[PDB]
């Protein structure tokens, strides 16, 4: 369970995903967004991964 | 005619040094030097770049070990 958020700030992501952390059940997501930026692949590769 | 300057440093002797020759280059069309860190932390780190990069000002940065 989520909700959605018109945003394509990613340090807003990173606190989201310290969000999920504090919500305590996180182990992986699946998500995406309705655009086309590679530049957040890149921020996954540089912190999730 | 000021500019903001980042850089990293890991003490903050380097870093007083660092405004020290910000104002010696400021002799030359001014100068701005913004604050200053290093942790071994690749979150707080990437995580205090946009608090850092807040002011619309900072053209280039230096990185440390």
């Known amino acids: 369970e989520l909700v959605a958020m018109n945003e394509t700030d990613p340090k807003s992501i990173i606190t989201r995903i310290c969000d999920l952390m504090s919500d305590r059940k996180i182990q992986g997501v699946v998500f995406a967004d309705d655009t086309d930026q590679e530049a957040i692949a890149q921020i996954l590769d540089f912190i999730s991964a | ?65």
């Open chain 2, 1 to 65: 005619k000021i500019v903001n300057i980042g850089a990293v440093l890991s003490t903050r002797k380097h870093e007083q040094m660092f405004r020290e020759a910000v104002n010696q280059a400021n002799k030359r069309i001014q100068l701005q030097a913004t604050s200053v860190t290093h942790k071994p932390n690749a979150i707080q780190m990437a995580l205090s770049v946009c608090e850092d990069l807040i002011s619309s000002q900072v053209y280039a940065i230096l990185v440390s070990h």
